[PDB]
Design a binder for this molecule. Structure first.
Ligand SMILES: Cc1cc2nc3c(=O)[nH]c(=O)nc-3n(C[C@H](O)[C@H](O)[C@H](O)COP(=O)(O)O)c2cc1C
Ligand SMILES: CCCCCCCCO[C@@H]1O[C@H](CO)[C@@H](O)[C@H](O)[C@H]1O
Ligand SMILES: CCCCCCCCO[C@@H]1O[C@H](CO)[C@@H](O)[C@H](O)[C@H]1O
Length: 364
């Protein structure tokens, strides 16, 4: 764990250690209005011994939402709710980035004001469910809907919505933003060949499949500065329905394109739930040459694997998702080899403080 507990520079920030709390949707936002709240602020501040916190995905508009009760970042009240979170986190000494979210086709009309979802094309995500509010206190799981293909004008609108969400995040006191371009969501529906059937300049070729990503990142950078923009990618997982035919090429190229934008970090989502594909070391080393900023990986890491990835020159920082849910003091536990609590799946989403803020710190 020695390297894991070394500080690191992230743009204009000095971070305490190499541990990241990656984005973790908890569906705790206040209703009506999908507003970040007190319980969330406590939750994040409890975990502020991380080097970096990346918020749960936060939708950039009403039609960007995938799941019931996720917090938005487009209304004034939503910005203010996030400010209570960022104030709490900053009082503990920690950096926090907002994960800007558009789910594209991975939603249900019930979550987007009855609208049909949008995507690169009209392809439904196969074997994918989201959850909706059905009036009960627990999430109601449902099949996703068939999307409509985005027009030119839809692309302009979404870019504008991302751009403004970045400014909103700065107004909310975040230190930066993370673009969610991973886990089968909207941008990923353009990147991955088998999700993109477009015949215009946003599909077919590799350069066209990366164009939406390029244009969104350019707008984010223009709005808030490259030193405040990270991006998340998922080259090899396919759980939410996006498959690329030549992911080593596509994602090495994406990494090099993002390097050209000088984004402050690149975050690789190596596992999604129990989708844990073989991610060759040779590929990881290629990504490390293609993108020369701070490289973050998350997915089934433990202390040993995290330290090894850093010492082998594969990663600069490591995210721990599920362990951070149940271990607010995860860094201290990793450093000392204290046993980790395990999380309760039934309280991951929805509800209140139970299973959110009531996991204790370690006590022998
Ligand atoms: C409850 C839960 C919610 C998640 N929500 C998001 C999210 O909002 N955005 C995202 O990019 N990843 C999300 N993820 C994925 C995690 O960031 C992480 O990449 C994944 O859980 C693998 O890391 P782990 O094996 O350490 O948990 C979620 C994971 C879990 C368990
Ligand atoms: C610095 C010491 C003062 C601590 C301020 C504590 C703020 C807690 O705030 C409380 O959080 C609860 C959720 O846990 C909500 O249900 C309450 O409405 C909210 O007032
Ligand atoms: C409205 C938001 C109020 C946030 C108050 C800070 C919440 C985190 O409080 C932290 O909780 C840890 C237990 O997990 C304690 O061990 C730390 O001492 C405590 O400061």
């Amino acid at each position: 764990x020695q390297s894991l507990f070394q500080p690191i520079t992230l743009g204009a920030l000095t971070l305490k250690n190499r541990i990241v709390m990656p984005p973790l949707t908890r569906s705790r936002a206040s209703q009506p209005g999908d507003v970040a709240n007190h319980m969330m602020a406590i939750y994040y501040a409890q975990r502020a011994s991380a080097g970096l916190i990346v918020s749960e995905g936060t939708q950039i508009s009403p039609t960007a939402k995938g799941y019931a009760w996720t917090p938005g970042i487009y209304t004034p009240e939503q910005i203010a709710g996030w400010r209570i979170v960022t104030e709490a986190v900053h009082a503990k000494g920690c950096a926090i980035f907002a994960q800007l979210w558009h789910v594209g086709r991975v939603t249900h009309p019930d979550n987007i004001d009855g609208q049909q979802p949008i995507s690169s094309s009209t392809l439904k995500a196969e074997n994918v469910k989201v959850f909706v509010d059905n009036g009960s206190d627990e999430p109601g799981f449902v099949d996703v809907a068939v999307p409509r293909a985005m027009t030119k004008a839809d692309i302009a609108q979404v870019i504008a919505d991302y751009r403004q969400a970045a400014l909103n995040a700065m107004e909310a006191g975040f230190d930066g933003i993370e673009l969610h371009a991973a886990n089968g969501y909207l941008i990923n529906q353009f990147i991955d060949s088998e999700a993109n059937n477009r015949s215009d300049e946003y599909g077919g070729s590799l350069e066209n499949r990366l164009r939406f990503l390029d244009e969104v990142v350019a707008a984010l950078v223009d709005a808030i500065g490259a030193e405040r923009v990270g991006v998340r990618l998922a080259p090899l997982t396919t759980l939410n329905g996006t498959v690329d035919a030549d992911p080593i090429l596509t994602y090495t190229a994406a990494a090099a394109l993002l390097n050209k934008h000088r984004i402050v970090y690149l975050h690789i989502a190596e596992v999604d739930w129990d989708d844990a594909p073989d991610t060759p070391v040779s590929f990881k080393r290629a990504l490390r040459e293609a993108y020369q900023g701070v490289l973050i990986y998350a997915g089934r890491y433990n202390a040993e694997k995290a330290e090894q990835a850093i010492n082998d020159g594969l990663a600069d920082m490591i995210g721990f998702g599920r362990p951070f849910i149940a271990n607010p003091d995860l860094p201290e536990r990793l450093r000392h080899g204290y046993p980790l609590a395990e999380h309760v799946p039934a309280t991951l989403f929805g509800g209140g403080e139970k299973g959110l803020t009531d996991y204790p710190t370690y006590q022998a």
